[PDB]
Scaffold this active site. Structure first.
Site, mmCIF file in Angstrom:
data_model
loop_
_atom_site.group_PDB
_atom_site.id
_atom_site.type_symbol
_atom_site.label_atom_id
_atom_site.label_comp_id
_atom_site.label_asym_id
_atom_site.label_seq_id
_atom_site.Cartn_x
_atom_site.Cartn_y
_atom_site.Cartn_z
ATOM 1 N N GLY A 73 0.903 -1.160 0.000
ATOM 2 C CA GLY A 73 0.000 0.000 0.000
ATOM 3 C C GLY A 73 0.915 1.176 0.000
ATOM 4 O O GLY A 73 0.632 2.128 0.741
ATOM 5 N N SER A 156 -1.637 -3.484 -7.474
ATOM 6 C CA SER A 156 -2.093 -2.600 -6.374
ATOM 7 C C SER A 156 -1.311 -1.298 -6.541
ATOM 8 O O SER A 156 -1.428 -0.660 -7.593
ATOM 9 C CB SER A 156 -1.847 -3.245 -5.038
ATOM 10 O OG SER A 156 -2.155 -2.377 -3.959
ATOM 11 N N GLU A 258 -13.674 -8.232 -5.294
ATOM 12 C CA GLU A 258 -12.690 -7.466 -4.550
ATOM 13 C C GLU A 258 -13.164 -6.030 -4.352
ATOM 14 O O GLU A 258 -13.864 -5.479 -5.196
ATOM 15 C CB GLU A 258 -11.279 -7.582 -5.178
ATOM 16 C CG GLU A 258 -10.929 -6.730 -6.382
ATOM 17 C CD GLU A 258 -9.429 -6.487 -6.504
ATOM 18 O OE1 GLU A 258 -8.891 -5.706 -5.683
ATOM 19 O OE2 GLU A 258 -8.794 -7.090 -7.397
ATOM 20 N N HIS A 289 -8.458 -9.806 -4.418
ATOM 21 C CA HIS A 289 -7.199 -9.153 -4.744
ATOM 22 C C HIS A 289 -6.022 -10.128 -4.848
ATOM 23 O O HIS A 289 -5.865 -11.039 -4.037
ATOM 24 C CB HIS A 289 -6.858 -8.068 -3.722
ATOM 25 C CG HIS A 289 -5.817 -7.103 -4.205
ATOM 26 N ND1 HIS A 289 -6.151 -6.014 -4.988
ATOM 27 C CD2 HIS A 289 -4.484 -7.095 -3.986
ATOM 28 C CE1 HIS A 289 -5.015 -5.384 -5.228
ATOM 29 N NE2 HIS A 289 -3.983 -6.014 -4.648
#
Lengths: 316, 316
Positions: A73, A156, A258, A289
């Site tokens: 992230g 991501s 997701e 994911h």
């Protein structure tokens, strides 16, 4: 569960009995070897990338280039992690490509747009290499690379990074001839928003939760910012009009079940209506994911590879 | 790189060009389904376990029981993580076993011997289930389980947990008839020591480093303790004499190139000389920590499964 690792290790509880399809041992599997090496791309920040080369087709033809940007992230992950390393092994051999797998600065220490600026540094690095014949010192032997056939694949966070690059090339802000990125592949793109979408308010996944996504953004965006910051939301009060930007072919692959699905579909369909934009949207049903990399043996993982290859072959 | 996640995401740098063998797509793979569900085993601590059942052989014969304890450093991980979930999918179908995959309390919040006491609670939970016919409410349908055929499989931290259980049964301290654990399988057991072994002073792995191992112990052992605490070192000034304890059949599987290799071999060979102890030691060469689960498609992963099955079949 207040710190990231703690929350990640908190776990999810299946509300219900569930079934999964597992692939068993095959006795005469087929083999490829893949060569890999690490090199610093940015000395001040001591950032490494790893380079991969299928030994098989390094004698056959010039290799296209796949720059893989890993997930997390903007807060965790490394190229050297078996999860990501293995994915790149698969990218290299499945796509028959020289794969470039960079690390980028992570948050909350180096917050956005560090990753974005590091991603650029990777491309600049590639430019230096292309105009200096450094590919001969890439490995003990000689690599032949097609710098006119570069593709960016993002997972991501890397999918956001990919989009950030796609805008910067399309806006004409950066140009790195002889390097030409012919296509972007955003896999589970990490976009955000103050407003939830339906999927975001729907059921947690095995691992991703809406809390965890907000925590990522809190740790990653610059201090004071909201999930509508352009760096997170590509379409809010965000400067990018993008209706003027000439974006290259793009592929948006997401899991049906997701949380990010809906925001990633909105992204895809907005770009499709901005015109002059070959933007495919692929939703894999019942998938969450990272399905392509979490479950490398599955029908879906295998299909994702074939689609990306077909996308790449169509741009030659 | 001062916090655990940061250090984990710091990354390793290959000193040298390296090669790996990758398995490609097979078009007519074979399929099993596996049923899985989550249940709380310890209500005060709200600890869940996940239960797995191969649908295929649930109609064929009574299923042995494999209690899988996941890895980490007593500091991270969950059953719900795709890494571990997937491993258990593979255990269930490959071994034809009912698999029990518990979460346990993690450090630095719940430090040792929380995990050890939680592991016991799992077994006690199993005992309650065995003497109450709760296996019928395990799934919508009916599961037939052989509680006389229980085996404990531990990864890293779980291998220590496994050894902790193996001592407690062998010492006669705990007895849970009709449940009988017939064997332990420590995979990359997470033991420690103030003294390094050679392997510990040797090259970092992809992900495990000696710093990271010391950090785990610092976060995990009770305050004031050293890496020679019995909970970490099974053979120092540590109370367990073990020369008197009747341990059951044990399997120690480790990677040839892994930091823990040497301490885990010492463990194995000490137990072999304490007599009355069927202790096999299996070293997979050129392999690092977690090879069996990190690289599920490889020749080694497949072989590890077969060995555990053969170990289990030999105890019937």
């Amino acid at each position: 569960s207040m710190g990231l690792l703690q929350l990640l290790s908190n776990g999810t509880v299946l509300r219900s009995e569930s079934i999964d399809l597992i692939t068993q041992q095959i006795p005469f599997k087929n083999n490829q070897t893949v060569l890999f090496k690490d090199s610093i791309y940015h000395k001040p920040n001591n950032l490494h990338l790893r380079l991969y080369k299928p030994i098989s087709a390094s004698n056959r033809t010039a290799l296209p280039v796949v720059v893989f940007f890993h997930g997390g992230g903007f807060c965790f992950g490394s190229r050297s992690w078996p999860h990501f390393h293995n994915f790149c092994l698969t990218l290299a051999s499945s796509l028959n490509a020289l794969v470039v797998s960079p690390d980028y600065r992570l948050a909350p220490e180096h917050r956005l747009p560090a990753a974005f600026e590091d991603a650029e540094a990777v491309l600049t690095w590639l430019w230096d290499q292309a105009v200096s014949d450094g590919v001969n010192h890439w490995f003990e032997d000689g690599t032949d690379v097609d710098f006119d056939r570069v593709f960016v694949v993002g997972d991501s966070s890397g999918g956001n990074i990919a989009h950030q690059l796609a805008v910067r090339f399309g806006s004409g802000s950066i140009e790195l001839t002889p390097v030409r990125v012919r296509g972007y592949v955003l896999m589970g793109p990490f976009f955000g928003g103050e407003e939830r979408t339906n999927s975001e308010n729907g059921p947690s996944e095995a691992l991703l939760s809406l809390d965890l996504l907000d925590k990522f953004w809190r740790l990653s965006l610059p201090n004071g910012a909201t999930r509508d910051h352009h760096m997170a939301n590509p379409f809010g009060p965000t400067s990018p009009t993008l209706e003027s930007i000439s974006l290259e072919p793009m592929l948006v692959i997401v899991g049906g079940s997701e949380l990010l699905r809906d925001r990633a579909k909105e992204y895809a369909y907005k770009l499709k209506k901005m015109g002059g934009k070959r933007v495919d949207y692929i939703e894999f049903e019942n998938k969450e994911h990272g399905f392509y990399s979490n479950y490398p043996s599955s029908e879906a993982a295998e299909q994702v590879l074939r689609i990306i290859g077909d996308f790449m072959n169509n741009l030659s």
